[PDB]
Amino acid sequence: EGCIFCTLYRKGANIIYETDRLFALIDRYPLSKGHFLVIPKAHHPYLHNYKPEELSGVLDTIRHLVQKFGFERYNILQNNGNHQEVFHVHFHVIPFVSADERLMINWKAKSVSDKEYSEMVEEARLRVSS
Amino acid sequence: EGCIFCTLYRKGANIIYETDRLFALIDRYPLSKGHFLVIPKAHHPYLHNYKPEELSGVLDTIRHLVQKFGFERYNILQNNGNHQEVFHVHFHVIPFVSADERLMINWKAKSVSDKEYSEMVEEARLRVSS
Ligand SMILES: [Zn+2]
Ligand SMILES: [Zn+2]
């Protein structure tokens, strides 16, 4: 077998929208009605593997499609090496339909000392500055 | 009270990175070590409320920061009216640290008839074409 998204673009069937750099598909296994995908034509496993040229216009295309589809409530999700099934970057756009039909996150947030946060901020500045 | 992200940008403290249109903060209540936020300076509740000018460079800035931070495994998440606490668009970048320290999604996917999928694709084409 080879990459499903490269294969689907090559086959050229069921593509709902296309730009110079991107194409869109309705998800065959949706979390919610209207769940679609915005996908760069170029193939790399992770977002940081792309040059800017290969990723041109993702958020614009998402905006364009949610407007055409009439979606007001939705989540954008992109997965790098966590919950990633397919190793070709793709952006999920997942409409909120109802409580049992939507993106479902278990948001277990940790709290930090102010000083653990001051440290975290300083460390981030060090990384940015390197 | 008024918008936390507008307030935090105005106060100008703890900003880790900035571009003409965006700024970044380390999340004060992280899902995982290094969880940060890329935030447009301009204020609207939802992604589709922004013009392209106000959203310029989000994915580039995310790429830039994950590279500076050395993150290889991470999720990008943006919430419009589902699991949204703050009504000013912000992109979560959430590193995968371990199984109990990462973005946790309950991925309950539905299956469809080929013909329910052919219908879904046709309906999407109709919406795009309108
Ligand atoms: Zn591919
Ligand atoms: Zn704001």
**Residue B85 CA, ligand 1 centroid: distance in Å:** 35
What resolution in angstroms, rounded to 1 decimal?
Answer: 1.9
CB proximity list for B29: less than 8 A, separation 6 or greater? A109, A110, A111, A112
How far does the CA of residue B29 sit from the closest CA of chain A (Å)?
A: 5
- In angstroms, the Cα distances linking A102 to B105, B106, B107 are 11, 10, 10
**Domain boundaries, given as residue ranges, for chain A:** 1-130
The values of phi and psi at residue B98, to 5°, are -150, 180
Q: Is B90 a known active-site residue?
A: yes
Token pair for residue B30? 């992280």
CATH of domain B1-130: 3.30.428.10
Half-sphere exposure of residue B123: CA atoms within 13 angstroms, side-chain side: 13
Query: Which residue's structure tokens are 């409580």?
Result: A99
DSSP assignment of B76-112:
EEEEESSS-SSSS--EEEEE--BTTBS--B-------
Q: Are strands A74-80 and B91-95 parallel, antiparallel or unpaired?
A: unpaired
**Residue of A44, A48, A83, A90 marked catalytic:** A90
Q: Which residues in chain A have their CB less than 8 angstroms from residue B110's CB?
A: 29-31
**Residue B1: other Cβ atoms inside 10 A:** 4
The answer to whether the Cβ–Cβ distance between B72 and A48 falls below 8 Å is yes
Per the entry, the structure determination technique was: X-ray
Q: Binding residue per annotation — A3?
A: yes
